């Protein structure tokens, strides 16, 4: 189905601390009140960036595949959290049609809502994530703190989910005015 | 001091690095021209 | 500069100063110490791996090595006498020891001598157009040296190729390794060579007897990533102790400035490297060697 | 049009001859900016 | 058409490809360790095979 991302999809654009200021920035952001295609597994295309929100109290969704052909002889990024370890690899994996070598990188680390921004446009993969306890996509405001900046340089035009209701939105290049509170937390934003 | 007053001529005839220099001269001149205009207008407005 | 009245006299360019108050000077506190703080990494950057590589790639398929999380001794390169071309754009080789960078990219390939000049911002020609493009705002060092002794042989070395045709010029650091038949005319080639249907690549004729212009040159291009992230690739420069509550000339990861460093109460989030202001002026730092 | 708005960055990255060109661009721009400011303030002061 | 108080004729020998280093604001072995011209050099450099 479709829901609206009222003002979801805002993340911290850079590692700069700003407090009690309104700062205008141009980046790939989720447009306010944009349609998010709702899923209850498909080979969804990756565009400029993608926003993933999953409402999953039992935490079925373990990870995501990001790639082009999502098969052998193209380096295809894999993120699979399994309990303690959020295994990340960029091997030319041979994937299953319905999943659930040459490794150039490897790293090792509904009330539960996890919001995630994946953007590959800097040329190194960027993940921004936030978990908020909730009561569709909730109406309110959250800022996503970056988790990992994988310097992998993998071409990604498509993505799949490894598994729980999840909503997918697409980041678009928009200027955003961000409000920072005394503590430097983005508490409000304006889609210009 | 740019080769051509026409902006399109500069772009079509010169390669980008060289064109940027010439465009900068045009920008500097045009921006100065407009600043002159605005300043005279505020002075004139004050008289009015 | 004898006395304040004399400063006034000089300011007014007059030997006689009238009654009044005259602003003559601008007082400032001078820094007492120089602080250098770089992240405490001891790991030489694997520059040899690139420079001392046995085989180089063809220019059309130029190799890219990423350099990160190491101390780069650039002296090894600019104090070496091995290089004919060591051209640095937007940076100085001497200054390199004092700078940090998020990433460095070492693009290695081989070309002929007269085409070395095409490895530079905003150049034109076969190489710059179809093989390897440097951006107009390229901040990096290009290194090239003659390799006639290595890449040339009696009979001609044809292992090294270049792209001769392309439907458009390359974008900066755009890598095209396609072997699609170039459609010079209106007739589709359908992967078949012939009239107006040419193979896009061509070998270099590298013989030891070739003119220096046609002799092989090995080229390594270093691209410095000046981005807002924790800087990992740093110079050999030694960090010194932190001094607080004094006017000091500080240097954090190659960021120069003069200021008084004080313990802050700002609630920085773990990822945040440094703080800026209402005015977008840097006003807080997270120490590299200390949290 | 300078490589960096930060004056310290220019000096730390470039040798003095090369730095001079970039610094000149910054000076030209900053001096123009301040002249604009002063002129507007003179006009504003006159209104006050 | 020009007069000067003093003219200094600095003479030496180098290889061809290093002639380019005899100029203001150049770098390399010659310009660094052998003979350095000022950035504001006002004179003529003459070189022949
Ligand atoms: C990333 O990979 C995708 C998929 O292989 C590339 O898109 C292809 O581009 C070619 C050339 O334009 C087309 O013939 C294909 O039809 C495209 N496929 C798809 C699925 O779009 C893309 O060009 C690659 N990008 C980079 C940076 O190399
Ligand atoms: C910035 O952080 C401080 C510290 O957490 C916040 O101050 C607290 O606010 C809560 C909710 O009003 C109170 O229960 C605490 O007693 C406060 N703690 C202190 C130490 O004062 C402050 O509210 C935050 N700023 C905002 C507006 O989010
Ligand atoms: C969302 O999609 C529906 C159905 O296509 C459409 O009518 C509506 O205008 C869309 N709203 C947006 C643009 O968020
Ligand atoms: C995987 O590695 C081998 C050995 O380096 C290489 O020949 C092959 O091209 C790589 N994968 C593919 C299919 O591109
Ligand atoms: C998670 O996966 C890693 C890598 O395969 C493995 O080492 C670890 O034991 C796993 N933990 C489990 C079983 O939860
Ligand atoms: C490459 O080899 C030469 C000769 O051994 C050496 O002098 C140079 O330092 C090497 N490159 C490195 C390790 O940076
Ligand atoms: C070196 O790095 C570690 C990082 O945890 C730190 O504990 C230690 O204080 C550092 N030493 C110096 C030289 O400051």
Report the candidate in A5, A3, A59 with the shortest Cα–Cα distance to residue A29.
Answer: A5
Best residue in C89, C90, C222 to probe D by mutation, most D CBs within 10 Å?
A: C90
Confirm if C221 and C119 have CB atoms less than 8 A apart.
Answer: yes
Task: Give the DSSP per-residue string, C231-244.
Answer: --EE-SPPP-----
> What are the CA-CA distances from residue C124 to residues A120, C78, C114, C134, C167 (Å)?
30, 27, 13, 10, 15
Token output for C264: 């802050």
Best residue in C136, C137, C138, C171 to probe B by mutation, most B CBs within 10 Å?
A: C136
- DSSP letter at A30 equals P
Q: Is A182 in the pocket of ligand 2 (CB under 6 A)?
A: yes
Please name every residue paired with E40 in a beta bridge, in sequence order, or none if there are none.
none
Helix D16-47 vs helix B16-47: angle between axes, to the nearest 10 degrees?
20
Nearest residue, CB atoms, B43 vs list D1, D36, D43: D43
Nearest residue, CB atoms, D47 vs list B35, B39, B46: B46
Best residue in D8, D10, D12, D17 to probe C by mutation, most C CBs within 10 Å?
A: D12
Task: Give the DSSP per-residue string, chain C.
Answer: --SHHHHHHHHTT-SS--SS--------PPP-EEEEE------B---HHHHT-SS--BGGG-EEEEE-SEE--THHHHT-S--SEEEEESS-TGGGGG--BS-EEEEEEEEEGGGGGGSSTT--SHIIIII----TT--EEEEEEE-HHHH--TT-B---EEE---SSPPPTT------PPEE-SSS--TT--BTTEE-SEEE--B-TTS-TTTSEEEEEEEEE---SS---EE-SPPP-----SSEEEEEETTEEEEEE---------TT--EE--TTS---EE--SS--
Alpha helices in B1-48 (DSSP H): 7-13, 16-47
Q: Is A69 in the pocket of ligand 4 (CB under 6 A)?
A: no
Cα angle: E11, vertex E17, E21; to 5 degrees: 55
Alpha helices in chain D (DSSP H): 7-13, 16-47
SS3 D45: helix
Take atom 13 of ligand 4 and give the residue whose Cα is closest: A73
| Distance between CA atoms of residues C167 and C182, nearest Å | 8
Token output for C148: 């006639």
List chains touching C (3+ CB pairs under 8 A): A, B, D, E
Take atom 5 of ligand 6 and give the residue whose Cα is closest: C52
SS3 B14: coil
Please name every residue paired with A89 in a beta bridge, in sequence order, or none if there are none.
A78, A106
| Distance between CA atoms of residues C9 and A80, nearest Å | 76
The CATH architecture of the domain made up of A2-192 is Sandwich (2.60)
> What are the CA-CA distances from residue E46 to residues E23, E26, E49 (Å)?
11, 16, 11
| Distance between CA atoms of residues E24 and E42, nearest Å | 9
Q: Is E27 on the interface with C (CB under 8 A)?
A: yes
Confirm if A113 and A55 have CB atoms less than 8 A apart.
Answer: yes
Confirm if A175 and A190 have CB atoms less than 8 A apart.
Answer: no
Nearest residue, CB atoms, A151 vs list C68, C267, C270: C68
Experimental technique of record: cryo-EM
> The tokens 């690549």 sit on which residue?
C201
Please name every residue paired with C250 in a beta bridge, in sequence order, or none if there are none.
C35, C257
Token output for C49: 């791996």
Establish whether chain E is in contact with chain B, requiring a minimum of 3 CB pairs below 8 angstroms: no
β-bridge pairing A34-39 and A2-5: antiparallel
Q: Which ligand is nearest to the CA of C168?
A: 1
Q: Is D14 on the interface with C (CB under 8 A)?
A: yes
Chain C nearest CA to D33, separation (Å): 16
How far is CA B29 from its chain centroid? 4
How far is CA A5 from its chain centroid? 14
Phi, psi of C128 (to 5 degrees): -65, -25
Report the candidate in A38, A44, A14 with the shortest Cα–Cα distance to residue A26.
Answer: A14
Chain C nearest CA to A19, separation (Å): 7
| Distance between CA atoms of residues A28 and A37, nearest Å | 18
> What are the CA-CA distances from residue C246 to residues C26, C257, C258 (Å)?
20, 13, 10
For residue C55, the tally of other CB atoms under 10 A from its CB is 11
Q: Is C262 on the interface with D (CB under 8 A)?
A: no
| Distance between CA atoms of residues C88 and A55, nearest Å | 52
Q: Is A1 in the pocket of ligand 3 (CB under 6 A)?
A: no
Nearest CA in chain A to C267: A183
How far is CA C78 from its chain centroid? 14
Asked if the Cβ–Cβ distance from C121 to B15 is below 8 Å, we say no
For residue D1, the tally of other CB atoms under 10 A from its CB is 13
| Distance between CA atoms of residues A132 and A115, nearest Å | 8
Helix (H) or strand (E) holding A54: strand A49-55
Task: Give the DSSP per-residue string, E1-49.
Answer: ----S----------GGGGGGSSTT--SHIIIII----TT--S------
């Amino acid at each position: 189905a479709y829901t609206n991302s009222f003002t979801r999809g805002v993340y911290y654009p850079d590692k700069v601390f700003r407090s009690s200021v309104l700062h205008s920035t141009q980046d790939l952001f989720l447009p306010f009140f944009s349609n998010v295609t709702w899923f209850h597994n498909p080979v969804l295309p990756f565009n400029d960036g993608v926003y993933f929100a999953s409402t999953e109290k039992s935490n079925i969704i373990r990870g995501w595949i990001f790639g082009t052909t999502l098969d052998s002889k193209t380096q295809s990024l894999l993120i699979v959290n399994n309990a303690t370890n959020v295994v990340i690899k960029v091997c030319e994996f041979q994937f299953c049609n319905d999943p659930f070598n040459n490794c150039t990188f490897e790293y090792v680390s509904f009330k539960n809502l996890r919001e995630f921004v994946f953007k590959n446009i800097d040329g190194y993969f960027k993940i921004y994530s936030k978990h908020t306890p909730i009561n569709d996509l909730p109406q309110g405001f959250s800022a996503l703190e970056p988790l990992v900046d994988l310097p992998i340089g993998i071409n990604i035009t498509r993505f799949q989910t490894l598994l729980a209701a999840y909503y997918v939105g697409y980041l678009q290049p928009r200027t955003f005015l961000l409000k920072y509170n005394e503590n430097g937390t983005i508490t409000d934003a304006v889609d210009c | 001091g740019a080769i051509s007053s026409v902006l399109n001529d500069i772009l079509s005839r010169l390669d980008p690095p060289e064109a940027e220099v010439q465009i900068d001269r045009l920008i500097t001149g045009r921006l100065q021209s407009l600043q002159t205009y605005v300043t005279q207008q505020l002075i004139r407005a004050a008289e009015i | 500069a004898l006395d304040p009245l004399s400063e006034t006299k000089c300011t007014l360019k007059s030997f006689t100063v009238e009654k009044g108050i005259y602003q003559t000077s601008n007082f400032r506190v001078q820094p007492t110490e120089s602080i250098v703080r770089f992240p405490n990494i001891t790991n030489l950057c694997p520059f040899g791996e690139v420079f001392n590589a046995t085989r180089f790639a063809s220019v059309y398929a130029w190799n890219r090595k990423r350099i990160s999380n190491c101390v780069a001794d650039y002296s090894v390169l600019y104090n070496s006498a091995s290089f004919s071309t060591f051209k640095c754009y937007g940076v100085s080789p001497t200054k390199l020891n004092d700078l940090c960078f998020t990433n460095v990219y070492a693009d290695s390939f081989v070309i002929r001598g007269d085409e070395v000049r095409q490895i530079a911002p905003g150049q034109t020609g076969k190489i710059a157009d179809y093989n390897y493009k440097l951006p107009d705002d390229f901040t990096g060092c290009v290194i090239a040296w003659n390799s006639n002794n290595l890449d040339s042989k009696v009979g001609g070395n044809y292992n090294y190729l270049y792209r001769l045709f392309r439907k458009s010029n390359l974008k900066p650091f755009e890598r095209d390794i396609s072997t699609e038949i170039y459609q010079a005319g209106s007739t589709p080639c359908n992967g078949v060579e012939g009239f107006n249907c040419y193979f896009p690549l061509q070998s270099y004729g590298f013989q030891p007897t070739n003119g220096v212009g046609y002799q092989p040159y090995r080229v390594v291009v270093l691209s410095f990533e000046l981005l807002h992230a924790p800087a990992t690739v740093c110079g050999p420069k030694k960090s010194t102790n932190l001094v607080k509550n004094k006017c000091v000339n500080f240097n954090f990861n190659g960021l120069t400035g003069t200021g008084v460093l004080t313990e802050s109460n700002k609630k920085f989030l773990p990822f945040q490297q440094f703080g800026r202001d209402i005015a977008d002026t840097t006003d807080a730092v997270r120490d590299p060697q200390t949290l």
